[PDB]
Amino acid sequence: VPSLTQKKFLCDRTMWRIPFSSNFMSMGALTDLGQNMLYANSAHALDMT
Amino acid sequence: QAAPNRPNYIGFRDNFIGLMYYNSTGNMGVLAGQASQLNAVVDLQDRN
Amino acid sequence: SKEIPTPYMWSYQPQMGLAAGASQDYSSRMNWLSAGPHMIGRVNGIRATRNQILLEQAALTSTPRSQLNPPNWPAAQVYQENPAPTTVLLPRDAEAEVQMTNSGAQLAGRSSFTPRQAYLTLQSSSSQPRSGGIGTLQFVEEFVPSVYFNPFSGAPGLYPDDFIPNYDAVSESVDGYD
Numbered sequence: 001v002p003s004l005t006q007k008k009f010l011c012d013r014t015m016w017r018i019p020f021s022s023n024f025m026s027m028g029a030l031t032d033l034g035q036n037m038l039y040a041n042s043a044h045a046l047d048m049t
Numbered sequence: 050q051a052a053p054n055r056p057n058y059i060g061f062r063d064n065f066i067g068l069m070y071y072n073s074t075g076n077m078g079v080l081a082g083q084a085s086q087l088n089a090v091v092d093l094q095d096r097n
Numbered sequence: 098s099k100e101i102p103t104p105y106m107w108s109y110q111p112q113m114g115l116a117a118g119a120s121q122d123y124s125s126r127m128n129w130l131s132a133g134p135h136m137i138g139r140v141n142g143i144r145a146t147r148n149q150i151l152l153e154q155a156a157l158t159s160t161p162r163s164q165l166n167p168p169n170w171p172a173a174q175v176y177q178e179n180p181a182p183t184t185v186l187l188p189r190d191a192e193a194e195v196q197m198t199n200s201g202a203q204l205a206g207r208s209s210f211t212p213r214q215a216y217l218t219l220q221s222s223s224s225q226p227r228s229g230g231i232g233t234l235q236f237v238e239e240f241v242p243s244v245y246f247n248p249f250s251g252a253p254g255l256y257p258d259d260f261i262p263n264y265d266a267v268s269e270s271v272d273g274y275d
Contacts, residue, residue, distance in 0.1 A: 037237045043106035043120065088131050 072096045098248050101145045105260060107166075107240040114175070114230015116166045116240050118262030148244045155241040165243070165259035168266045172228040176235050180221040187217050 018024070020031040033039065062068075070076045072092045080089040103122050110117035129137045160174050193211035197203040207214060231239060249256050258264060263271045 038233060041106075041242050042237055042240065043108045043118075043123070045108065085133070087133060091128055091131055 098250070100246065101141060101148060102245055102247070103144065104148065104151050104242040104244045105257075106242050107236075108262070109233070109236055111233070114170065114232065114235075115168060116236060119165075119243065119257075119260035122242075148246075151242050151244050155243070158238050159241055160239065162239075164266065165257060166240070166266065169229045170231055172226050175227055175229075175231050177226050178222065182218050183221045184216050184218045187215055190214065 019026065020034040021027055022033045072094065074092065074094045077088075077092050078090050081087050103126060105119050105121050106123070107116050108118040108120070127140050129140050132140070162174075190208055190211045190213040193208065193213065194205065197210050198205065203210075243257070245257065258269075259266060261271065263275075265272050
């Protein structure tokens with residue numbers, strides 16, 4: 001029978017992570033980006049969809 | 050025709066995730082010195 | 098009223114370069130009600146050191162102005178882009194080409210016909226420098242966290258009135274239609 005594939009992925013028992021580091025990499029507990037003045041010495045609103 | 054009931058293993062809950070009413074501003078704990086109106090646990094209502 | 102006050106952070110609008118709104122430090126603050134007068138005497142003082150740091154880094158980084166969030170930064174205090182004179186090496190001798198093409202039959206599918214070649218160094222920056230609005234790398238330089246060493250203690254007039262987000266400094270009025 002002519003067939004079309006179907007793909008799905010499971011990541012159960014885990015939580016998606018998007019680290020604040022500029023390179024997305026664990027360079028330390030205190031992220032570099034989350035410590036620059038721009039996000040530290042200036043309030044910022046945030047919107048996510 | 051009969052069959053067999055399913056199987057529910059009701060049991061206590063892993064790590065006791067519950068018996069202790071953990072983070073909840075309405076029912077908090079205390080670890081303060083006896084002679085001190087203070088506390089040592091504030092437990093805001095967002096922490097798992 | 099108070100005195101070691103908790104600095105008023107400045108918000109940004111990635112839109113028009115001028116800043117937007119302002120508010121006391123909404124989040125970053127300790128919770129000392131579980132403390133006694135041995136570290137509630139040190140949190141008070143760590144915050145004072147924070148205030149002094151903010152003052153110094155404000156008077157050392159900012160460019161002294163007369164209105165907290167100016168409605169239109171003048172064209173001399175906004176970081177301008179000064180690129181380098183672009184130099185194009187004009188890749189041919191126009192006279193030489195035109196001459197030979199007219200002469201002989203060269204249809205010409207450095208140069209061999211003539212060893213002449215000249216750059217055309219141009220100007221690269223702009224005609225009229227930018228005027229209104231500063232970039233992010235200037236926001237974190239101009240609007241350092243502002244410390245308000247006393248609350249709204251005065252007549253309506255004297256009151257940092259560039260803090261309320263809904264201010265139209267052009268007309269000294271709160272906008273509407275909301």
